[PDB]
Amino acid sequence: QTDVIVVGNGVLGLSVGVEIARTRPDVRVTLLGKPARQYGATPAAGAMLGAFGEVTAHALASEHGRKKHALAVQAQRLWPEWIESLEATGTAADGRIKTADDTVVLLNTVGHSALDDANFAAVLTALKEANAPHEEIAVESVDWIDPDPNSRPLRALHIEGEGSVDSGILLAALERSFLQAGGRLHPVDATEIRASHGRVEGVVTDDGDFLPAGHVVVAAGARSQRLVAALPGLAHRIPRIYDGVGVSALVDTWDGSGPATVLRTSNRAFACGLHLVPRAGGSVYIGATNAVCLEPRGAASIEETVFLFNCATHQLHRGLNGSELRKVQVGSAPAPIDGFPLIGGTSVEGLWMLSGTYRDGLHMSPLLARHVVSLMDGGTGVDGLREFRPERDLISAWSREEILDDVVRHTMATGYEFPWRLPLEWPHMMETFLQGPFAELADRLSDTYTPPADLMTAIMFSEREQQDELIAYYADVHREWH
Amino acid sequence: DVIVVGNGVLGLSVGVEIARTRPDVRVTLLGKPARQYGATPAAGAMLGAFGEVTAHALASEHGRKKHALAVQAQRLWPEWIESLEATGTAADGRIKTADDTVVLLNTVGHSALDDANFAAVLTALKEANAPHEEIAVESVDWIDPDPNSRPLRALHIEGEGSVDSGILLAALERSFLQAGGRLHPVDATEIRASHGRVEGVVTDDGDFLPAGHVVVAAGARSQRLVAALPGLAHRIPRIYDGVGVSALVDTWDGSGPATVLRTSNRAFACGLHLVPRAGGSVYIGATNAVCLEPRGAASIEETVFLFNCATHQLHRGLNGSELRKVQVGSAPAPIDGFPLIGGTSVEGLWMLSGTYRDGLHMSPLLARHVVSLMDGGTGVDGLREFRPERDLISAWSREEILDDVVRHTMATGYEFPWRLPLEWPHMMETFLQGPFAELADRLSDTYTPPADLMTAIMFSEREQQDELIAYYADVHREWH
Amino acid sequence: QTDVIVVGNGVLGLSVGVEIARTRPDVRVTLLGKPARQYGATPAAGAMLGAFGEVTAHALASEHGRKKHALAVQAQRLWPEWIESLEATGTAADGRIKTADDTVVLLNTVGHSALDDANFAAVLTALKEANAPHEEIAVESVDWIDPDPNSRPLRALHIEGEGSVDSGILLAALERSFLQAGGRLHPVDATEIRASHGRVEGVVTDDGDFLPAGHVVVAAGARSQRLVAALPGLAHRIPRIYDGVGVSALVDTWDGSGPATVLRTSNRAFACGLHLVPRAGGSVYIGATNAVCLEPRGAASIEETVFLFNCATHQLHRGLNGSELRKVQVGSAPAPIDGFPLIGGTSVEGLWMLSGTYRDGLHMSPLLARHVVSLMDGGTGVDGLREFRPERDLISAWSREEILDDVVRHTMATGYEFPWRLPLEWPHMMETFLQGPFAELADRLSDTYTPPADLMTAIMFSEREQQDELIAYYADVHREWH
Amino acid sequence: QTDVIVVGNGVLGLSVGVEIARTRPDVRVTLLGKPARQYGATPAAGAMLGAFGEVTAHALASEHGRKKHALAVQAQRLWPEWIESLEATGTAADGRIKTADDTVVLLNTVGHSALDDANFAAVLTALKEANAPHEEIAVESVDWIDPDPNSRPLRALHIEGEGSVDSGILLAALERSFLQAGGRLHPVDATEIRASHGRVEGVVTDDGDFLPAGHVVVAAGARSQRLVAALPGLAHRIPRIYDGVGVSALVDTWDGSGPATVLRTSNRAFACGLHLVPRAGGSVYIGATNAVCLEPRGAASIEETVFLFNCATHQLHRGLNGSELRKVQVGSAPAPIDGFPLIGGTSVEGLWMLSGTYRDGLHMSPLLARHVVSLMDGGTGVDGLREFRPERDLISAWSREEILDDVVRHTMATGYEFPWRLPLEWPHMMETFLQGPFAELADRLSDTYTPPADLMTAIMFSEREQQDELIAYYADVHREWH
Ligand SMILES: Cc1cc2nc3c(=O)[nH]c(=O)nc-3n(C[C@H](O)[C@H](O)[C@H](O)COP(=O)(O)OP(=O)(O)OC[C@H]3O[C@@H](n4cnc5c(N)ncnc54)[C@H](O)[C@@H]3O)c2cc1C
Ligand SMILES: Cc1cc2nc3c(=O)[nH]c(=O)nc-3n(C[C@H](O)[C@H](O)[C@H](O)COP(=O)(O)OP(=O)(O)OC[C@H]3O[C@@H](n4cnc5c(N)ncnc54)[C@H](O)[C@@H]3O)c2cc1C
């Protein structure tokens, strides 16, 4: 066959499906996945087209982080034409994909200085380096916000051409554009990829059927590694992906109003963030908690919903307090164990992977789609996506020392973001007594690999058995690659 | 031919008792499976009698009568449950979720409510010779509060428990069908009557159903439906929406308490409680807010307040537990604070509504009462004051209500709990008294809304206040 | 006699004493007052040489306020030579009057946006209009501060040539400079001013003695009016002066360190402010609460000490938490009932008044001294200080409406400055329910006069009898002047 | 006559001085110490005559603790006659020593359940076992208190015949009674005790003089050991006494009122406690913080004053917020390194010690005085005070394991007593991460001795040099006694 199967019906699967169908009208492109989209990140995303807004001091302090940021800047440049090309297969009545053009980043004191002050400076620096249109503005000039004075921002940063989409209208427009270009939707799940003599044959589905193909693209979010790793000798060659459980909410505003821009903070403790994405029809999206879980989870915790609502009502708009909760949304950000995406070719001919995009995969989608389509066509794709090839040794983007400083900082930030009220001696006490146990965990896990902070905290508070299983995993990966 | 309008616990309870007692007569029950604004699905629910006692309630004749009826209702529940589970099988689930209740006293609230109400509960238990014990907090199973939010006193009440409201509704429907009842899943738009007699009910699909008996148990919609009939607009007390929020939570470890865990009733009939459920679930409730217009969704504030209280005052483990569902229902909130139970001036027209925050518990007693009246009996003796066609009851002086509304307002602060400069509470007490006194005087020379409704009126639009002055004036004309 | 008696040994008394003795070597100048300085504002002041730092939006919005600011800029220009002239009468071991040259103004969210944001903008505006040397700086570049992250500043403003003095070393240097110029210190209190046929004869002291003079200058701070008002028909001709009771503290720092600049916020609720003034020898000054009292009070309340210490440890330096409290200081800022100073001549020949300087009298002292000395010598003194003649109808600088908005704003600010944690509906509730009672008090007090906000809140929470006595006072003043 | 010198003018010195002068008309008794009473615990104490009020679960669980409680009950029986005998040397105008007969113990949730709930139960148990007159009462029936509802007590306990004295009037009555019985007050400090051939010769004073005597009693509070340890080979034979630095305050109440009983909580984190002791003349005493310091400190920290005032205004009476602060008091509770007093004879003939009474020495004073005076006369004194002889190996009353559990519990209690507001996961996190570092400190300090919790926390947060000096001290004590 020259037949192509895309495994997964999130934004990444459908984006790659659309680019393949449009570029090869000769070939049959079939996309698998069910309308339920169980643990789907895409439906739970607002979503922000985050590039400059996603900048942290920590990210920009590694080579691997500066490459990710560069790819996000490149992805930003594709969004206007990509949206035009998707709305062109529909009519006015289908709804607009774009919900805002611009973003305001707010700096308030409801957080750690060591994250929020460092990250605001890093965002300003990255905007100036990339010659992006932006302005530091008076907080008084930010429309709509009505924070608690004790939670108010004292600095604000307007970013032009960094906006948001309605993730639901984007999915509808992707499906529509996929069908329009000759794509076929088969609403079942893949259970197994079949390959022999180093070549893909096709995909077994969960109804027992077998679909033949010479090209399989895996974009099954957090299930992508488990699916490819079953193939011979790949178990320790594809980096593990965990579930980044994220909570968000849809709220009908007291008066039907909403902001004209995205409103956000910089990224906060363990990739949690506060943002408000505008929506049509008197709705706003608020997000977003993040927690790496070693097993999948389909429901918000009490703590996640309380923290999200408390931050939005104090830091963005007190009017949200009396506003109607329409929906609490939960999705799994695919969380790669080495903190970097899995994009491109495998050692198996015709087998491609598009996954581990964590908290910015929706934003990257048009760039990642174009990259994989160029590779499949004999091209080189996008420069700088080379380090993120799916079949690799675990990347070490930071020293153990840098990560141990980060995990303690982020731990303390869970306190300052609450915000807590404690005796002034207690924070220094906890900083000192956290360092030892995290240093001991990092040394015990592996001599060579260190999990990034988001994952290290989940491991710190996991069962002894789960820690032991990870020591074994890290050891098997060292054997395979050294 | 009997038509019951409404498919809540009250409608179905009366439907079941009619169908079982008069196999001769044809009983049709209206209402849709969606149960829009339905209180019953959002209730835990507690079989609250002693737990529902407040100092304020026990200080009026009307309050002492309500409490006595709640004690009487408690005695019916064991046989009523047995009679409803008997029409089903093991796989249908158990209606009863706990036999006993623990009342906790903590400092996350106003002394003027929580301390007074705990004493009142203890007093009422001793007066009724009810089996109970003040116990050491250390001996309360399961709870794991924040030390700063922990209880220092606890009260075990035997034979005051809880039901799964969802399994009760399923068992009522099933028992109704089994006794010959007919479920027609549409809403009533209009009651038809002429020459002082009910003819039947127009449905929202355009149809007309004839009957010589109509029982209105449509919760918070009950008055709006009967008040359309000639000269009844100012003879049936208004019912508003007591919007209540609760939640279903899957516990971190699948565990749950063996008893109900609760505080006494708090600001504006809000309360904190945990009702056990089967299958590693717990129910937590319950906020209350009187709204002049219906509302079908929880506010952010309601969800945050409910979750914050449960995680700090009951169990910190609930913080990491999975939210399965946020529930919203309308407690039917009668403008004079008392239920609407019994006959009208229109022959064959009965009303069963305005049961606010205890209607589920009362349901078997209220059902038996209305069925006895329909059969030519006298029903239950002290339900007489609550006949639906009446002048607005005045159970409290204006002065008592103005003290209550200021106390409850201050309690919204202490229940948060707030942290403010120590001069600010006394400042707010002084500056709240004037505006509430001015509102009560402006509303009517004779009627005073109870606190729960007065705060909703205080913060409503000028037009909504003016419409209520007109309503109160028209009721004075009609009855004096 | 040509003899001069100065009644009062605060900065104003001693400053005028020094300027009289130096300008008229012919005349005998005697200065009364005890070393205890009971209710003395001067010893309790840090003190800041505030000009740009004292700017508020409210001040810059009136003609009266723009004049006060201009006088403060003029006073600033006198301080270098005035200090040189006072240190010249001493030796190396006497210590330095000047403790800092520069001031950093900090903006944090531990307060009302309606005061702190407006006042920070007003300071920046006034600096730019005057072309005064200043820089908005990164908070990270502010030396020494170590705030609680949740209480930290996000903006900072360096003002060159706006500094501080040790008020205690200034008093010692003024006494010494007074003696050096021929002055006589008589350490007793005046009980009575004696006058007949419209001329001063002298002063009865509290030891029973009588001192004759043809010139008496009253600079007795908050006691100044009570002393002159006892003279015939003057009870309702000299505006009342109340006690602005202010609390500050001297702290020995954990490590002997201190900041090189003044550190301050803009003025806050009811003229409270948060500041740290450097001192020699491992000490710092922290201030300063303000509360108008209708009766004098010589001791700090619990609330004042807790509020002062809580603000300094959270907003300036957590190290102050473990630092040793050396002294709690209480002084009476002389609070004139119409909000303007009492400077110059009376209807009684040879009777002068120098008082009602509230919260800036130390900074103004060299200008106010020179002004009164020029008037006594037949000159015109400083232009624009003529409006503040002590014998006057109560000035009305603000509409009743402006004052009622101010008092409600400042009342709400006591909450945000705490800072309080409240349900989000409660602040709007309190704003609404405060308006009525303050409007009712203003109407009941007088048809013509309105007390400024700082005094109105003290009257609101005073006894019924004290309110009634003020209605009578305001009525008697209307009779006297209309 | 034979010469006796008492070194120290606290309650213990003067109590022993009074009993010697009255009992031994043969001997000439001179008592040293200045009216300043530098670091004096006695002037800073309220003070409560604590017996049942001082009971904790920890105390009642050891033989040593049940003995201390029994001695406190015995001391209580002496107070009525002792007061009668001291007031008899004065007149009506000298003031009453006794300020209350009864005590109310309050239980609120502003603290750790593991201390406050356990201690309230232990007090109730001890009262019932002794058949002591007491009643658990309704909180509504407690006179005077007006707490913040969120900080209010939910249980209260009236104890009859457990009261309080004005420590200042007790000191004045002791001095007066000492003079009346033939005692001599020499207001200077001892610098050195002189001894040769194993016998005391006398005392060198800080004015250079030498006073001869055959009997010297050291009751210099926290200076007692430093003074005796200078004598040959005694540096490691007399257990070190550190400074239990305690802060209290005198407050003039808003309305001149006060409670008729002592109002207290049980003892809280590191022997801090909250109490109100009635005083004459519209004053109340509030206390009392406690912190073991390795060096003396004569001034309150900001933290201590804020914590004391915050607890009293919220938990006892909101009226104290607007009340006038008259005095912040600091004293050194003599804190023995092994947690037991130093009472009786040394290896040096005529050298006695009466010290290390920490937080209950004022209550014990008449019993301890009678004991030492009986020993000096050839008697046996009080049975069970013999084990507290000053020249001893450090006592080990508690396992290392018991102390490590206590220090973690008390550390957590500093949080709950604040009270803090934190995310709900944080307290369990802090409990886990505190255990290791305290266990590591205890192991490193000595193989044999473990400091009690109050001292262990001070050592944990001391300088490396101070920890090393204590390892050396503990090692030298092991050498000396094994
Ligand atoms: C959050 C919450 C918690 C509570 N907890 C408790 C508790 O623990 N214990 C307790 O005893 N009580 C509790 N209550 C109170 C109790 O739920 C109510 O008092 C009682 O259930 C009211 O019953 P009802 O049948 O009158 O009303 P509902 O349950 O509201 O039933 C009325 C029904 O009529 C239907 N309807 C409306 N209009 C029409 C129409 N035109 N035609 C046909 N049908 C119509 C509605 O859809 C609805 O299903 C609680 C209430 C709330 C809100
Ligand atoms: C804040 C606080 C509250 C307390 N509350 C209570 C309570 O309610 N009830 C209770 O029973 N106990 C209480 N105590 C404990 C009690 O105060 C002490 O146990 C007791 O006062 C110790 O008496 P003392 O005479 O040994 O020491 P101190 O009272 O310290 O007296 C020692 C004296 O010796 C002097 N001195 C020092 N060096 C020399 C020298 N070289 N020569 C001469 N004199 C010297 C000192 O200046 C001082 O005056 C409290 C303690 C504090 C600090």
DSSP symbols for A404-465: HHHHHHHHHHHHHTTT-B--TTHHHHHHHHHHHHHHHHHHHH-SS----HHHHHHHHTS-HH
Residue listed under structure tokens 């905290």: A457
SS3 labels along D393-417:
CCCCCCCHHHHHHHHHHHHHHHHHC
User: What's the gap in Å between the CA of C397 and the closest CA on chain B?
Assistant: 29
Q: Tell me what percent of chain C is helix, strand and coil, each rounded to the nearest 5.
A: 40, 20, 35
Give first-to-last CA distance, chain C, whole Å: 37
Cα angle A256-A261-A263, degrees, rounded to a multiple of 5: 95
Which alpha helices (H) appear in C277-425, and where do they start and end? 302-315, 361-376, 400-416
Asked if B38 contacts B219 with a C-beta cutoff of 8 angstroms, the reply is yes
DSSP per-residue letters across C191-227:
EEEEEETTEEEEEEETTS-EEE-SEEEE--GGGHHHH
Q: To the nearest 10°, report the CA torsion of A23, A24, A28, A34.
A: -10
Say how far apart CA D214 and CA D231 lie, in whole Å: 16
Asked if D50 contacts D360 with a C-beta cutoff of 8 angstroms, the reply is yes
Q: Do the annotations mark residue A190 as ligand-binding? A: yes
Q: Which two tokens stand for residue A351?
A: 């087998």
Asked if D212 contacts D202 with a C-beta cutoff of 8 angstroms, the reply is yes
User: What's the gap in Å between the CA of D410 and the closest CA on chain C?
Assistant: 19
DSSP per-residue letters across D97-121:
SEEES-EEEEE-SSS-HHHHHHHHH
Q: Which two tokens stand for residue B271?
A: 């309360």
SS3 A147: coil
Asked if D142 contacts D106 with a C-beta cutoff of 8 angstroms, the reply is yes
What subunits touch chain D, counting only 3 or more CB pairs under 8 A?
A: A, B, C
Cβ contacts of D194 within 8 Å, gap of 6 or more: D200, D201, D202, D203, D204, D210
Chain C residue closest in CA terms to A113: C149
Amino acid at A77: R
Q: Which two tokens stand for residue D72?
A: 């406190």
Backbone angles phi, psi at C241, to 5 degrees: -120, 125
Residue C383 CA to its chain's centroid (Å): 21
Backbone angles phi, psi at C399, to 5 degrees: -65, 150
User: How many residues are given for chain B?
Assistant: 480
SS3 D91: coil
- In a 13 Å sphere around the CA of A94, the CA atoms on its Cβ side amount to 21
Please give the DSSP secondary-structure letter assigned to residue A60. G
Asked if B69 contacts B365 with a C-beta cutoff of 8 angstroms, the reply is yes
Can you tell me which atom of ligand 2 is nearest the CA of D189? 42
Identify the CATH number of the domain defined by range C97-163+243-333: 3.30.9.10
Say how far apart CA D306 and CA C321 lie, in whole Å: 9
Kindly list the distances between the CA atom of residue A309 and the CA atoms of A417, A476, C254, in Å, as whole numbers in the listed order: 13, 43, 41
SS3 B255: coil
Asked if C342 contacts C225 with a C-beta cutoff of 8 angstroms, the reply is yes
Cβ contacts of A343 within 8 Å, gap of 6 or more: A353, A354, A355, A368, A371, A372, A385, A388, A389, A390
Say how far apart CA A277 and CA A232 lie, in whole Å: 44
Asked if D110 contacts D151 with a C-beta cutoff of 8 angstroms, the reply is yes
Amino acid at A202: G
Asked if B50 contacts B121 with a C-beta cutoff of 8 angstroms, the reply is yes
CB atoms within 10 A of CB D350: 22
Asked if B317 contacts B144 with a C-beta cutoff of 8 angstroms, the reply is yes
**Which sign does the torsion angle of CA B417, B259, B330, B118 carry?**
negative
Asked if D277 contacts D392 with a C-beta cutoff of 8 angstroms, the reply is no
Say how far apart CA C310 and CA D98 lie, in whole Å: 36
- In a 13 Å sphere around the CA of A474, the CA atoms on its Cβ side amount to 20
User: What's the gap in Å between the CA of A430 and the closest CA on chain B?
Assistant: 20
Pairing of strands D134-137, A29-32: unpaired
Asked if B367 contacts B219 with a C-beta cutoff of 8 angstroms, the reply is no
Give first-to-last CA distance, chain A, whole Å: 37
Chain B residue closest in CA terms to D322: B423
Asked if D379 contacts D239 with a C-beta cutoff of 8 angstroms, the reply is no
CATH superfamily of A99-162+244-333: D-Amino Acid Oxidase, subunit A, domain 2 (3.30.9.10)
Which strand (E) or helix (H) includes residue D428?
A: helix D426-445
Say how far apart CA D315 and CA D145 lie, in whole Å: 8
Can you tell me which atom of ligand 1 is nearest the CA of B275? 8
Kindly list the distances between the CA atom of residue B255 and the CA atoms of B315, D163, D290, in Å, as whole numbers in the listed order: 11, 49, 42
Say how far apart CA C423 and CA B419 lie, in whole Å: 10
D98-164+249-336: CATH architecture? 2-Layer Sandwich (3.30)
Q: Which two tokens stand for residue D136?
A: 């658990």
SS3 C291: strand
Resolution (A): 2.4
Sheet containing B2-5: order of strands: B182-184, B27-30, B2-5, B213-216, B349-353, B340-343
**Contact between B413 and C423 using a beta-carbon 8 Å cutoff:** yes
Say how far apart CA A352 and CA A219 lie, in whole Å: 9
Asked if B207 contacts B193 with a C-beta cutoff of 8 angstroms, the reply is no
Pairing of strands C4-7, D275-278: unpaired
Among all bound ligands, the one having the nearest atom to the CA of D38 is: 2
Asked if C134 contacts C158 with a C-beta cutoff of 8 angstroms, the reply is yes
Cα radius of gyration rounded to whole Å, chain C: 22
Measured in Å, residue D333 CA sits from the centre of ligand 2 at: 6
Tell me the Ramachandran region of residue B223: left when phi exceeds 0, alpha when psi lies from -120 to 50, beta otherwise.
alpha
Amino acid at C37: R
Q: Which two tokens stand for residue B46?
A: 């507690």
SS3 D49: coil
**Contact between A426 and D415 using a beta-carbon 8 Å cutoff:** yes
SS3 labels along B277-333:
CCCCEEEEECCCEEECCCCCCCEHHHHHHHHHHHHHHCEHHHHHCEEEEEEEEEEEE
Which strand (E) or helix (H) includes residue A331?
A: strand A324-336
Backbone angles phi, psi at C244, to 5 degrees: -80, 85
SS3 B212: coil
Which neighbouring-strand residues pair with C185? C31
Which strand (E) or helix (H) includes residue C435?
A: helix C426-445
Say how far apart CA A176 and CA A158 lie, in whole Å: 34
Cα radius of gyration rounded to whole Å, chain D: 22
Please give the DSSP secondary-structure letter assigned to residue C266. P
Q: Which two tokens stand for residue D352?
A: 């006695």
Which of A243, A250, A283, A302 is the best mutation test for B, with the most CBs of B within 10 A?
A: A302
Residue B150 CA to its chain's centroid (Å): 27
Burial class (CB in 10 A: 0-12, 13-18, 19+), D456: buried
Pairing of strands A215-218, A351-355: parallel
**Contact between A309 and B303 using a beta-carbon 8 Å cutoff:** yes
Which of C422, C432, C440, C462 is the best mutation test for B, with the most CBs of B within 10 A?
A: C422
Measured in Å, residue D331 CA sits from the centre of ligand 2 at: 7
Minimal-distance CA residue to ligand 2 atom 49: D37
Q: How was this entry determined?
A: X-ray
Q: Is the CB of D341 under 6 A from ligand 2?
A: no
Number of H helices, E strands in chain C: 13, 20
Say how far apart CA C435 and CA B258 lie, in whole Å: 52
Say how far apart CA C261 and CA C164 lie, in whole Å: 8
Minimal-distance CA residue to ligand 2 atom 18: D361
Which alpha helices (H) appear in D221-269, and where do they start and end? 224-228
Q: Is the peptide bond before C80 cis (omega within 30 degrees of 0)?
A: no
**Contact between B424 and C420 using a beta-carbon 8 Å cutoff:** yes
Backbone angles phi, psi at D119, to 5 degrees: -75, -35
DSSP per-residue letters across C120-187:
HHHHHHHHHHTT-SEEEE-GGGSSS-B--GGG--SEEEEETT--EE-HHHHHHHHHHHHHHTT-EEE-
Q: Is the CB of D363 under 6 A from ligand 2?
A: yes
Say how far apart CA B210 and CA B207 lie, in whole Å: 10
Which strand (E) or helix (H) includes residue A86?
A: helix A63-87
Say how far apart CA C116 and CA C137 lie, in whole Å: 18
Q: Is the CB of B173 under 6 A from ligand 1?
A: no
Say how far apart CA D286 and CA B136 lie, in whole Å: 31
Closest CA to D333 of D292, D302, D366, D363: D292
Backbone angles phi, psi at B440, to 5 degrees: -60, -45
Tell me the Ramachandran region of residue A233: left when phi exceeds 0, alpha when psi lies from -120 to 50, beta otherwise.
left
Say how far apart CA B151 and CA B156 lie, in whole Å: 13
Among all bound ligands, the one having the nearest atom to the CA of B183 is: 1
Asked if D336 contacts D361 with a C-beta cutoff of 8 angstroms, the reply is no
Say how far apart CA C431 and CA A318 lie, in whole Å: 15
Say how far apart CA B458 and CA B433 lie, in whole Å: 12
Say how far apart CA A446 and CA D119 lie, in whole Å: 47
**Contact between C420 and B418 using a beta-carbon 8 Å cutoff:** yes
Say how far apart CA B331 and CA B456 lie, in whole Å: 15
Q: Domain limits of chain B?
A: 398-479
Residue listed under structure tokens 């005061």: C115
Q: Which two tokens stand for residue C420?
A: 């309080």
